[PDB]
């Protein structure tokens, strides 16, 4: 049941912004590891004396990496005279965020019809304001409200090239890397208490609950066409094996974004390319399931995937889950940085053709039990 209760018009995920200590090194690492190209910049060379911001793109996926300069470079400025291209940026907020949480997602940005109205309606409906609507060059409006922890939900709306003040990147620096990633499928938060988190976010967005012992309870909020998907997890406590949600909250100093799920047009090629680069600057992947897991795949998805396609999953460590509607291929990186906090999921969905409807195949929750079984079975 989709009651289509969005309180404002939401379009798609727009971008994800990482707050960094050094944006250059994080962005270069991510670019090589994920196959995203450098597409825009806002920094000293564009007249920004406040923050360094670099944009990577792959298909429709946009990753933004931002770090503060010395406040001394902009000490003469006031907000009316700022050279920052992202007016919500604040040196002290950014340093406090990074000291508290380490490397992670500050902003989950969605494109909306009218960011000012989305902001007003959100706050009218319980949203805690974070940055008021600001119109950039009479062309783009941006506004921010609190989502969970120190993560903000950022609204962006265009009258009619990322943001004013960003420059498109010189082709010599823009190497056309592409490993097949195409868009953000969902963005997931970890919180101490799921109930209040859900009530708050669904309260101010109108997002509805999307239809669904090892660590967590979770629920998923979705926009009208279910293309914006925001799962939220809470720990289950005292569980024999320690909850990965609780470990997150400890090392992150509280709630924050747990993982970003990146849809690939060809997950086999994406994983081949990412795995070639794991030990030369890219990303590592979580330990693969035992062969029993892939022996058990035939009985569960043998009508969706051929033997060769199942064997290809086994080579790459890919996990498979299935719903009543569709099938999900997925795999998880190790944490992106020093702390066991944020990681990335690569996914591809099979089914639900209408275009493909959102959330086709679910989020892989069936893989908790099927993994656990596989390990005890393989213990043989």
**Residues of each annotated binding site:** 186, 259, 345
CA 62 to CA 94: how far, in whole Å? 20
- The H-or-E segment that residue 92 falls in is helix 91-101
CB of 340 to a copy of itself, least distance (A): 7
Helix, strand, coil shares, percent, the chain, to 5: 30, 35, 40
State which H helix or E strand residue 328 sits in: strand 326-332
- For ligand YFM, the closer of residues 117 and 233 by Cβ is 233
What binding mask, one character per residue, do residues 76-115 give for a copy of itself by CB under 8 A, x or -?
-------------------x--xxx-xx------------
Edge-to-edge strand ranges of the sheet holding 129-136: 129-136, 140-148, 151-158, 104-112, 10-19, 61-68, 51-58, 37-42, 167-168
Of residues 280 and 354, the one with the C-beta less far from a copy of itself? 280
Contact flags string 153-192 toward a copy of itself, x per CB under 8 A: -------------------xxxx-x---------------
Does position 261 bind Co ion by CB under 5 A? yes
Q: Compute the least distance from the CB of residue 2 to ligand YFM, in Å.
A: 18
β-pairing verdict for 256-264 and 343-351 = parallel
Q: How far is the CB of 286 from ligand YFM (least distance, A)?
A: 6
Under the binding rule (CB under 8 A), the answer on residue 343 touching a copy of itself is no
Output the CA–CA distances (angstroms, integers) from residue 225 to 105, 109, 244, in the order listed: 25, 17, 31
Nearer to Co ion, 50 or 188 (CB): 188
CB 332 within 8 A of CB 343: yes
Residue 23: in which H helix or E strand, if any? helix 23-34
x/- map, 336-375, Co ion, by CB under 5 A: ---------x-----------------x------------
Binding partner selected for residue 174 from Co ion, a copy of itself, ligand YFM, none, CB under the kind-specific 5 to 8 Å limit: a copy of itself
Indicate which of a copy of itself, ligand YFM, Co ion, none lies near residue 181 (CB less than 5 to 8 Å, by partner kind). Answer: none
Residue 218 touching ligand YFM (CB under 6 A): yes
283 makes contact with ligand YFM (CB under 6 A):
no
How far are the Cα atoms of 16, 31, 120, 184, 274 from residue 36, in angstroms, in the given order?
13, 5, 34, 13, 11
Residue 25 binds a copy of itself (CB under 8 A): yes
Distance separating alpha carbons of residues 79 and 48, to the nearest angstrom:
13
CA distances from 370 to 192, 294, 376 (A): 26, 10, 10
The footprint of a copy of itself on residues 235-254 (CB under 8 A) is 250-253
Q: Which residue is nearest to ligand YFM (CB)?
A: 367
Q: How far is the CB of 17 from a copy of itself (least distance, A)?
A: 15
Tokens representing residue 237 in the block: 């406590």
CB of 179 or CB of 363, closer to Co ion: 363
The set of residues, in sequence order, having a beta carbon less than 8 Å from that of 81 and lying 6+ positions away, is none
Q: Which does 98 bind (CB under 5 to 8 A by kind): ligand YFM, Co ion, a copy of itself, none?
A: a copy of itself
Give residues 152-211 in contact with ligand YFM (rule: CB under 6 A). 186, 188
Alpha helices in 225-365, H assignment, sequence order: 244-252, 267-276, 291-295, 297-301, 307-316
- Cα torsion 299, 304, 308, 314: sign: negative
By CB under 8 A, what part of segment 295-324 binds a copy of itself? none
Q: Residue 78 binds which entry of ligand YFM, Co ion, a copy of itself, none, with Cβ cut-offs from 5 to 8 Å by kind?
A: none
Q: Which residue ranges make up the site for Co ion (CB under 5 A)?
A: 261, 345, 363
């Amino acid at each position: 049941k989709n009651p289509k209760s969005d309180k404002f018009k939401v379009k798609r995920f727009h971008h994800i912004e990482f707050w960094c200590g050094d944006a250059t090194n994080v962005a270069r690492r991510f670019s090589w590891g994920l196959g995203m190209r450098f597409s825009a910049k806002s920094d000293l060379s564009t007249g920004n004396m406040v923050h360094a911001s670099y944009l990577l793109t792959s298909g429709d996926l946009r990753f933004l990496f931002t770090a503060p300069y010395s406040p001394s470079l902009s000490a003469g400025e006031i907000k009316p005279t700022t050279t920052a291209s992202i007016p919500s940026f604040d040196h002290g907020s950014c340093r406090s965020f990074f000291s508290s949480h380490g490397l992670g997602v500050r902003a989950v940005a969605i494109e909306v019809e009218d960011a000012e109205s989305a902001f007003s309606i959100s706050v009218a409906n319980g949203a805690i304001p974070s940055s008021p609507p600001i119109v950039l060059n009479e062309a783009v409006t941006i506004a921010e409200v609190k989502l969970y922890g120190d993560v903000v939900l950022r609204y962006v709306s265009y009258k009619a090239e990322f943001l004013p003040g960003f420059e498109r990147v010189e082709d010599a620096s823009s190497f056309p890397l592409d490993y097949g990633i195409r868009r953000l499928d969902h963005a997931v938060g970890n919180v101490p208490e799921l109930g209040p988190a859900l009530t708050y976010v669904a309260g101010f967005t109108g997002f509805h609950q999307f239809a669904e012992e090892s660590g967590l309870n979770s629920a998923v909020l979705a926009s009208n066409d279910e293309m914006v998907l925001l799962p939220i997890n809470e720990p289950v406590h005292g569980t024999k094996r320690k909850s990965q949600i609780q470990t997150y909250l400890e090392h992150n100093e509280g709630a924050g974004l747990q993982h970003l799920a990146l849809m690939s047009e060809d997950i086999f090629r994406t994983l081949r390319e990412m795995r070639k680069r794991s030990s030369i600057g890219g990303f590592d992947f979580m330990p693969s399931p035992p062969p029993t897991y892939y022996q058990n795949l035939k009985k569960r998805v043998g009508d969706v995937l051929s033997d060769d396609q199942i064997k290809e999953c086994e080579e790459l460590g890919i996990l498979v889950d299935r719903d009543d509607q569709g099938t999900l291929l997925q795999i998880f990186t190790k944490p992106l940085g020093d702390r066991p906090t944020i990681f990335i999921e690569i996914i591809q969905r099979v089914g639900c053709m209408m275009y493909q409807s959102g959330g086709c195949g679910g989020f892989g929750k069936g893989n908790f039990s099927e993994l656990f079984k596989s390990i005890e079975e393989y213990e043989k």
